[PDB]
Amino acid sequence: PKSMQCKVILLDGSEYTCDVEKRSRGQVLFDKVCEHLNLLEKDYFGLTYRDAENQKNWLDPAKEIKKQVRSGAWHFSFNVKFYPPDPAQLSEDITRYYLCLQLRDDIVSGRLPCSFVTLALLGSYTVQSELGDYDPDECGSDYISEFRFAPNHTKELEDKVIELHKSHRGMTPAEAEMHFLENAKKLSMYGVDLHHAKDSEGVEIMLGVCASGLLIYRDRLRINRFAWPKVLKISYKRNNFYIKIRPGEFEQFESTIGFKLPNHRAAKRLWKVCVEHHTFFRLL
Ligand SMILES: CCC(=O)Nc1ccc(S(N)(=O)=O)cc1
Numbered sequence: 041p042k043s044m045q046c047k048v049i050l051l052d053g054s055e056y057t058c059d060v061e062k063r064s065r066g067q068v069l070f071d072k073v074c075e076h077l078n079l080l081e082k083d084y085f086g087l088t089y090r091d092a093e094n095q096k097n098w099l100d101p102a103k104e105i106k107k108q109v110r111s112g113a114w115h116f117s118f119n120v121k122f123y124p125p126d127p128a129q130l131s132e133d134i135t136r137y138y139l140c141l142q143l144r145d146d147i148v149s150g151r152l153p154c155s156f157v158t159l160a161l162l163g164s165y166t167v168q169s170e171l172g173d174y175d176p177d178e179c180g181s182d183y184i185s186e187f188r189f190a191p192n193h194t195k196e197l198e199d200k201v202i203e204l205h206k207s208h209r210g211m212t213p214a215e216a217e218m219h220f221l222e223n224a225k226k227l228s229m230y231g232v233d234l235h236h237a238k239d240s241e242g243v244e245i246m247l248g249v250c251a252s253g254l255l256i257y258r259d260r261l262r263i264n265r266f267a268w269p270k271v272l273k274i275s276y277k278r279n280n281f282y283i284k285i286r287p288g289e290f291e292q293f294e295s296t297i298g299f300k301l302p303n304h305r306a307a308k309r310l311w312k313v314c315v316e317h318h319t320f321f322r323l324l
Pocket residue numbers: 088095096097098119120233309310313
């Protein structure tokens with residue numbers, strides 16, 4: 041029975057290698073990765089791969105791996121798929137740990153914009169979780185952490201991480217990670233998956249997919265929000281993506297809203313992640 045080697049980049053930046061039967065469904069690989077990670081609260085996570093256009097795609101756990109990666113390498117990343125709006129309601133510390141690791145990459149990558157002070161506060165909790173209590177002997181006036189905190193590091197930021205780290209004496213790792221999450225969850229771009237699009241007039245917008253619905257950034261700022269409950273039907277056709285909105289009170293008709301995506305595969309990807317968010321955050 042023939043097996044294909046899988047390589048998975050984990051959220052700590054390390055590479056997990058395993059073998060699955062070549063006709064395996066995505067769930068098979070995901071189950072192996074989650075067992076490796078000692079992860080029980082698996083519903084929030086997924087694997088990604090890069091298609092022939094180099095676009096990130098979720099690996100569908102219900103479909104054959106070979107029919108998704110097609111002509112590409114069996115190489116994946118382990119990622120948060122559904123960002124919980126209240127991470128304190130997760131049952132296990134280790135789930136919150138993996139969510140912290142994802143958010144640290146969201147921040148360094150610039151997907152999750154963050155004020156100077158919030159960058160320093162998040163960094164101070166990460167340092168407290170990983171090294172424990174502040175030790176002066178390790179850090180002098182010229183200290184620069186190995187930890188990546190931000191898309192652009194400054195000496196001022198490193199200084200502010202140290203100043204806040206000093207305030208966290210006695211804090212345990214789960215405690216520090218919970219504080220990390222209480223701050224991160226409030227950020228306006230927390231768990232927002234952004235897709236480039238044009239409105240029905242050709243004006244460049246971003247569509248953000250998240251727990252609280254579909255966001256339209258008509259400028260660079262959120263100019264419209266469609267909460268999932270209002271959305272009855274999501275669909276795509278050629279390069280276009282549509283949402284069917286519930287009739288408002290006393291309104292005769294539903295309303296269908298249409299957008300232009302970069303190509304047909306980008307419309308399909310946006311449709312799939314919207315359907316998946318709608319389902320997940322309907323049940324949560
Ligand atoms: C940051 C982790 C990641 O890769 N997320 C992801 C992956 C794929 C898509 S999709 N299928 O293009 O909508 C959206 C978001």
